[PDB]
Ligand binder design. Structure first.
Ligand SMILES: O=C(Nc1cccnc1)c1cc(C(=O)c2c(F)cccc2Br)c[nH]1
Length: 340
């Protein structure tokens, strides 16, 4: 059914190769999840990604084009092959390169990211790990959100270490204050902080808050945003963090005009609405699409929502490796049953 072109990716997630469907000639990406059922955590992540990707049908979200069925007896089925959209590059590679990246690239890239998030957020899915390298870009300039391994809903299981250890959730440089500080307000606003960091990074072609560790990350955010308000400080989970913030002299926010000199006024207005300490003070993905900065591309009638919401109940279940394997195999079966 597929002719392998060349092996591209490795590792942690598995091996990624480019390929073509022999009959149609259609170019695809094939990801091999080797020994997919050996580790609970990894198997749970595979299951979660398969369901999330099967749930969405959106141009700015990576899609499963095919899932290869077992070709061996059930007991011998050990590695999963997922056929995905072939995406040549990513936003990290574009930002950090000799390629052009004008205000017009920023505007179009931001538009697509926000269009994809509006859809995902309406399904009650918080990606929690947005960063330029997870924003894949093809040769036609289509941006797609990938890597849904860290994604969660509005309600998560207390059985997971992350439930309590929010400061290890995702990547330090794009991690929302609520996760860093355990503010007990974990909504789609987590993603809008990440968007602001990505937006800033596209404007200057360098990371906005590249903290060397936990404290340095907090320092970096406060050097621009100013000291958090007492309402935020009181909500800080840990006393050592709370005490550390209070041990520092008062700081007023620095205008985005100083951080990004001579940058577009409408780009800084939108950036300001995204990068706020308080999750509820942040602009939503839907309201950001209505901002004058994205007026050129914005069509309310071409920016869909996702109905019905995605349910994370399956992920909260304590399953053994074998029970997760059965669930994954049932997902591959459902994929083919829905197609036929
Ligand atoms: O085509 C892809 N990768 C490529 C790169 C470079 C050259 N050729 C091909 C591709 C990757 C994907 C993904 O969802 C993906 C992944 F498999 C592994 C890690 C992150 C992510 Br996000 C879809 N498509």
């Amino acid at each position: 059914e597929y002719e392998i072109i060349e092996t591209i990716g490795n590792g942690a997630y598995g091996v990624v190769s480019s390929a073509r469907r022999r009959l149609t000639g259609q170019q695809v990406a094939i990801k091999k999840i080797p020994n997919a059922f050996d580790v609970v955590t990894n198997a749970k992540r595979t299951l979660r990604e398969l369901k999330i990707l099967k749930h969405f049908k959106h141009d700015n979200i990576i899609a499963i084009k095919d899932i290869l069925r077992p070709t061996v007896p059930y007991g011998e089925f050990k590695s999963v092959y997922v056929v995905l959209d072939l995406m040549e590059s990513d936003l990290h590679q574009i930002i950090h390169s000799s390629q052009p990246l004008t205000l017009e690239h920023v505007r179009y890239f931001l538009y697509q990211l926000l269009r994809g998030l509006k859809y995902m957020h309406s399904a009650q899915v918080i990606h929690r790990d947005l960063k330029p390298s997870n924003l894949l870009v093809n040769e036609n300039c289509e941006l797609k959100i990938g890597d849904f391994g860290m994604a969660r809903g509005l309600c998560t299981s207390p059985a997971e270490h992350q439930y309590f250890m929010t400061e290890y959730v995702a990547t330090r440089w794009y991690r929302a204050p609520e996760l860093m500080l355990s503010l007990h307000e974990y909504t789609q606003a987590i993603d809008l902080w990440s968007v602001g960091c990505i937006f800033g990074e596209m404007l200057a072609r360098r990371q906005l808050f590249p903290g060397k560790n936990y404290v340095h990350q907090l320092q970096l955010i406060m050097m621009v945003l100013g000291t958090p308000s007492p309402a935020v400080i009181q909500a800080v989970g840990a006393e050592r963090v709370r005490a550390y913030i209070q041990s520092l002299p008062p700081r007023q926010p620095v205008p985005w005009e100083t951080v990004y000199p001579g940058a577009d006024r409408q780009a800084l207005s939108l950036l300001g609405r995204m990068l706020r300490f308080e999750p509820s003070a942040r602009i939503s993905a839907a309201a950001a699409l209505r901002h004058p900065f994205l007026a050129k591309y914005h069509d309310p009638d071409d920016e869909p929502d996702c109905a019905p919401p995605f349910d994370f109940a399956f992920d909260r279940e304590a399953l053994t490796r074998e029970r997760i394997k059965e669930a994954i195999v049932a997902e591959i079966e459902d994929f083919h049953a829905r197609r036929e």
